[PDB]
Amino acid sequence: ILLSSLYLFNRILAWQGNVKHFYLFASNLLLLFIVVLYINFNTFSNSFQFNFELFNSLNPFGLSNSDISNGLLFGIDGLSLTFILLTVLLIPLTLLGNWYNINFNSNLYYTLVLAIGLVILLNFWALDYISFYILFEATLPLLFILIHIYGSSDSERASFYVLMFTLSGSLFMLLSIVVISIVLNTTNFINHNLFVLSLDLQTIIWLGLFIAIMVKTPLFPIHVWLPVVHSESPLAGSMILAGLILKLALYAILRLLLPLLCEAQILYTPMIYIISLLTIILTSLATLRQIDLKVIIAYSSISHMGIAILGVCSNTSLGIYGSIVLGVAHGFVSPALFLIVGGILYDRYHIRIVNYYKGLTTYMPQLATYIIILSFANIGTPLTGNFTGEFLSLQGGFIRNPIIGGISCISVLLAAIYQLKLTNKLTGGISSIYMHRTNDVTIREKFIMNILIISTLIIGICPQIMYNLLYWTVNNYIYII
Amino acid sequence: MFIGTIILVLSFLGFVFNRRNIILAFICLETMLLGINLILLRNSVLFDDISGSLFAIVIIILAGVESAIGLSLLVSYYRLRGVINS
Amino acid sequence: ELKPSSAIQRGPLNKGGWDAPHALHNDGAIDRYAHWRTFYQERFKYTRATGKSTLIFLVAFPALIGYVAYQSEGLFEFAGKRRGESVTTR
Amino acid sequence: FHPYNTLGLATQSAMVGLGAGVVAAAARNSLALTTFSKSGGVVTIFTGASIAYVFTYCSAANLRERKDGWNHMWAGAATGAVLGARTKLVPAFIGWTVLCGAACGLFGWTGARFNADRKASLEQSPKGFVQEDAHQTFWEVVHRRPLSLTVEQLGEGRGINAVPIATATEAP
Amino acid sequence: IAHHVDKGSLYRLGPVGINRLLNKASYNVINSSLSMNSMLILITIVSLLLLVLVMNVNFIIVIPVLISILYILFS
Amino acid sequence: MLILAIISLITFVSMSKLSDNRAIIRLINIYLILVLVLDSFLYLLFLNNQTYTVMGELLIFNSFTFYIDMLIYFIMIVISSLYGYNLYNNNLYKTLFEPKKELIILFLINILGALLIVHSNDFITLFVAIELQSYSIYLITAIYNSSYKASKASMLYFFMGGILSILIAYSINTYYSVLNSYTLHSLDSLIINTLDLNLILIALSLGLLFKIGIAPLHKWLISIYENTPILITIYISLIPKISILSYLVLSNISINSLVISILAILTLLVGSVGGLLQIKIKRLLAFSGLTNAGYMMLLLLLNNNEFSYLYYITQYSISHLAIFMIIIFSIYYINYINNQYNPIIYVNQLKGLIHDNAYLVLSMAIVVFSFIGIPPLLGFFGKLNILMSILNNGYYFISIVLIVASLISALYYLYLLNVSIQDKNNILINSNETVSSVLSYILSSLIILITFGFIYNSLIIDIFNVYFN
């Protein structure tokens, strides 16, 4: 199979010359395969189901059935399945959004994009700390290369930011993982809630883990790399980064931190709430005085992640469900806004300064409708998944701490301010003098945006449709005596 | 222990604070080896032990070959420049 | 006498592609304003106003929220509280 | 905790710093009476750093009646203040203060040692799962901890109660 | 906020401040191929001996000396 | 085999003409390969961690030294291939890379010195092996006497090595004067408790460590590495590090040493910070070597460091060989040869290499990200094992400093890739010339090892548990 499929790949490359059709086909097959897996997934059980092990000593190149397990573990539960489905949904759209604007070394570009997508998808399958960390860092070289070669004018500094900040956080994560390894001599996620470390040791390990979470989510005050890396990334890099790599952080909290360091998490929760309220308020305010389109869209994601964090550390089932739903809805909506600003407007006019843009409704009414819909979705209109996520997250946060959650309810207003201030200038007024008329949104762009819009609407009208995968998870991590 | 130690330390200070010539440098190397060996041999005698004297003989031979190689290096260095201005 | 091999033939790096008509009329003033705003960090200096905003937002505001969040931890329980009952636990 | 003798220890530190600055000045001279003329004030650098660090460390340790990393944080802050006064600029002074204080606070937190405290380290400590009902030590792990320990360490409230809810709310 | 905090202080404790700090420190550590190196080796030997003497006396007293030494070398 | 090779080679090189140098070197390359493959089965002696004292208790043989020995042979094979084969067949490369007549004999003798350092059970053997390696490495530095910088380098090296050798001999003799012995095997826990040997043993360790260039005595070695011919630097920067570090690890005479702790910290800081402002390739690589030597120095503070040290030294040897070979290959695409000993000198001379050779830059990226420690490349697991060891033994502050130093050094590691994936105006159109098959295959083998070594991690640890326990 693998030999034959490799032959097929080689022949397609030799004859056609551009791998991108093969990659699109492949990613669609992967999506279908994951859907088949969902069909055969038992939901009346809190146990990992499609388990396999790699690089075991008895079978380094195959799967292990040995009675000693020294390789890397993989498997899924409902929580991993949700994000995996999101990933396989997003990857083909990431390939498709750059279908025409890459005219050089295109095969390498598509290879990097598909590789990053596969790395994240595999990362969600990881079942122990070491493999999780391995696949968690494996993206950074690919992101560095991609941003450096296929990025905009300031792409060199962008690539250095995206590598350095994430390494900086990941190495403290590595300290915590090394401490866990040498203290427990185990690394798995299957039974790691069974080990009850001393409170002081929990308090120490929690620091490294949460520093990694601060850099990767990001949270205030170490969020300054994200707006850059977004603004100078090419479209696929921005869509992947906004839609999957940030959710890797939330998945990291739920999988690595909460089951193992429960008591220390209980001790540290108000500090988390300080940091999340900081990120929400301060980044939302800082968004008001930006002049770049992609930078503003990037700043939106940080605030939504702040609300997600407030949900996920609320020690309530509603808070956790809200954090997950908000993560999924953000993965639907933010790639769409990035598609607009960095693939439609940027590919037509090759500029991102806000002053140039005005009154796009006259020549491009369809693009204006899309902007309006996506912006009201981003600020949390009900019947959109974003609203369900923000509402449930805020419920959990208000329960966990009434004052802090009540103040956090100002995020609704702040989000409306920056987003609608942007869309007001973009859609209306008299058509700009600086730019000329160009085509309206095309069939491909409309297809991608329709996919994202219908996904967010579907989970916004009936968020319950996710519950069958998540009803174990909403109880697996809350710590009430 | 006394004569050897003082030869070692004075040759070391001559080497370090040399700002006169490179020959002084060679000589400080040799005299350091001398002082090391004198300390060694006094200890050999005090212990009535042969291991000390065996290592002294080996130092002698290795200092010989080290001097040979070092002077060869200096000559090869000179061949290109014609003059040693230190 | 040390020169690269004569065997090598070097041509131009052309990037190919179709030169689209230029659909934006760049405004030099806007570009300079954008560049100044984009690289403001290269020229930032600590003064009285800048230091004041720093000490407010990075120090005073976090301290306020921390005092609130550690003082109020576990203070409230609201679920189904009735008349006469204390909504406070301490 | 029995006190550090701040005065004496600071005096010895003054002596050590003066000697170290003298050695640095002699070196500086050799590498470049003029030795102190062309010193660059290194003798003052050493002397001031020594006095500041030692005096602030002992002072803070005595006042708080504790020995931990916070004392090193204060002492590093004082040392950074001394070293950043040389810039003659308020931002640089503040930066030296806060950052040297942070670095030395990290140093004091890890143990205020460059090598390791061998007896406390994991390799020389009781580890693994504990036996029948023994008290938990720092490196040891269990399957269940005593609920009274949870209630005392974490504190009452926010879902931490002496008795499981369902048991407490059972009818008879 | 957006300027003074985000592109101000956070970049100070970020890419820009670190860039300046590393520029200065690196310049200082790079700032007579023999005589100099010989002086270096003597200075290392004597400095190590005196530092360890101090450590035997009292380890707390040597911390400022190490801080000052690093200040000389990097700054 | 090594002694027999040295003797025969002296005879042949005496009786052969200057044109036969490369053929002779190919002969020895194949001979070493044959020895490595046919005599490998002697590992079986070391089953259950069986130790053997040999030559009247002068040499010690265990699994550890057997592995170091095999590694040194592999390194010698790779290094001799660079001299035994031409990259290109043009006049320029005949001028650039020609092997001296006696170079191979010097290489073999320095290898013998390194192996005797590794196996040394007695201080007399240690000192003789140190002096053998030191003399051979002086001469290797000096054999390219047409270079002004190489001769200046050899002289500075002679003097610094002589002083450090005198410090070492002094330490050996003080140990003799206190214990009337020349063996560390005479040492025991009772003896270490009873007597204060700390000063003597630390002086011996420092005398050995300053010979591989740990701070604050680095700069003389970085200058030597900068000023030697590039194919000489590939060797002299590696073998002494391996031999000295392996001896120190095996001896374990500085456990929990406060002075070694402070010096390892200082070495990390200087290697990371000082390499940032560098613009020359080989100075960048030498500061890389300094930082990695710091990572290995940390392992001298603890017991049971065999696995972490072996893994780290192996992956470092592979990465170091590979990065030097990549710099060597990238010479064919530069438009300016600086001189005949060091054809490429400045990092910026690689600018736009991806447009000339995409896969060369792919290999460069792989090796750089190994150095930074990106999983699942080998570099990550090397750093992981080191962190495991030092955290198990309570070196908390040193672990924090190691984190910080890896972060800082990532900057000047990525400097190379950064300039390499930028764009050059004059892009290779075509060429008839083929890079030599053999060296390209070797470079590819190193790259594939770095990339896909991790699949064998669990098998390696299983083997290790039976040969080192």
Ligand SMILES: CCCCCCCCCCC(CCCCCCCCCC)(CO[C@H]1O[C@@H](CO)[C@H](O[C@@H]2O[C@@H](CO)[C@H](O)[C@@H](O)[C@@H]2O)[C@@H](O)[C@@H]1O)CO[C@H]1O[C@@H](CO)[C@H](O[C@@H]2O[C@@H](CO)[C@H](O)[C@@H](O)[C@@H]2O)[C@@H](O)[C@H]1O
């Ligand atoms: C992610 C951010 C990283 C930054 C944080 C790292 C800092 C770690 C600090 C925590 C920690 C090592 C923990 C390492 C765990 C993994 C390491 C994590 C990764 C490493 C990067 C260092 O604890 C240090 O704290 C300093 C104060 O701050 C002290 O400074 C000094 O104070 C003065 C000297 O007395 C001087 O005046 C001066 O010398 C300094 O002032 C040190 O003495 C002290 O060793 C604590 O270790 C130790 O804790 C104790 C009781 O906790 C344990 O023994 C316990 O004994 C009973 C009670 O004792 C308990 O009944 C029992 O149950 C338990 O057996 C020990 O077994 C040991 O384990």
Ligand SMILES: CCCCC/C=C/C/C=C\CCCCCCCC(=O)O[C@H](COC(=O)CCCCCCCCCCCCCCC)COP(=O)([O-])OCC[N+](C)(C)C
């Ligand atoms: C037909 C004979 C050919 C054998 C030639 C060997 C040449 C060595 C040259 C370079 C060293 C390169 C890599 C050494 C591998 C370690 C072997 C071992 O397992 O390491 C163990 C000890 O683990 C350790 O400490 C850690 C070792 C650190 C290795 C770091 C790299 C890991 C990734 C390498 C993956 C291997 C590539 C396979 C691709 C299909 C020693 O094993 P051992 O002493 O029992 O000897 C093995 C039996 N032998 C003699 C017949 C071969």
Ligand SMILES: CCCCCCCCCCCCCCCCCC(=O)OC[C@H](COP(=O)(O)OCCN)OC(=O)CCCCCCCCCCCCCCCCC
């Ligand atoms: C470079 C970064 C670091 C690299 C570290 C790890 C690299 C791993 C390389 C990818 C290989 C993993 C994917 C293939 C493994 C699974 C093969 C398999 O057969 O699944 C095993 C599992 C159980 O099957 P079984 O027990 O045999 O019973 C069958 C009953 N009919 O059967 C199942 O339940 C199906 C399992 C589906 C798994 C989905 C995997 C998602 C992505 C697949 C390709 C990913 C390739 C990644 C490439 C980039 C590198 C990360």
